[PDB]
Ligand binder design. Sequence first.
Ligand code: NA
Length: 227
Amino acid sequence: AASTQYMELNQRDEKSPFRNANLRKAISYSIDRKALVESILGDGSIEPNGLVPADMAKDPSGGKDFAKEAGSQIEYDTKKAKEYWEKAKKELGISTLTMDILSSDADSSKKTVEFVQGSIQDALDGVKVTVSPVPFSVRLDRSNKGDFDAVIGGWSADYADPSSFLDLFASDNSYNRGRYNNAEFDKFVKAASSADATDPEKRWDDMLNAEKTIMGDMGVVPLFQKS
Ligand code: NA
C-alpha cells in the first residue's frame, strides 16, 4: 500500500528545457521536502528516499531494504539549486523559463502544488511557475497528450515489488507521461522485468541500478512517500 507522489517533467521535445538533467536537479534541489511533509501536509507523508518507497521491498537473500540499498540522491539545497540552474542556462542557451505545474484540484494537492510553485519560483532567478489544478479526467487526458510542463501525480503499489514503480519510467511505458528516456534506465528495468530474469539476485541488482539511474539524472522529481 506504499505510494510515492512525484512530479513528471515534459521531456517529449528535443529542445525541451526539461531534457536537461541540470535543470531537473535544480528543480529538485529547490524543494524542502521536510517542510512539505511536516508543515504543509502534516498527514503522515514522509520525505521520499527516491522513487521506490522505503520499508516496502527486501533483498531476496538478506533482510535489506531496497531504499536503504539504493541510497538517496534527493537533497534540499537552494545554493545548489541556483548553481545547477546556472549550468542549465548555459547548456540550454536560455535566459528564462516559464513553466506550468498541472495537478489535482484536491485540497492537499492544491497545498502541495502551491508550496512547490513557490519553492521553485523563489529559488531560481528567471524562473516563473504557474499552476493548473484540474479534475482527474482532465489531468489524465492532458498527461497522456503532453499538454503540460510539469505534472504532479503518484503511484501506489498493488504488490510490494520495486518494478511496480520502476517500470513506469521505461521510455516506452504509457505511464511515463513526461517521456523520460534514458537508455541505461531502460536496460536495467527491462532486464529485471523480462521473463528471462530467473536469477533473483541479478534481478535485484538490475532494479537497484534502475533506481540509481533515474535518481542520478532526476528523470522524475519525487515529492513524498505515504505508506
Ligand atoms: Na524566480
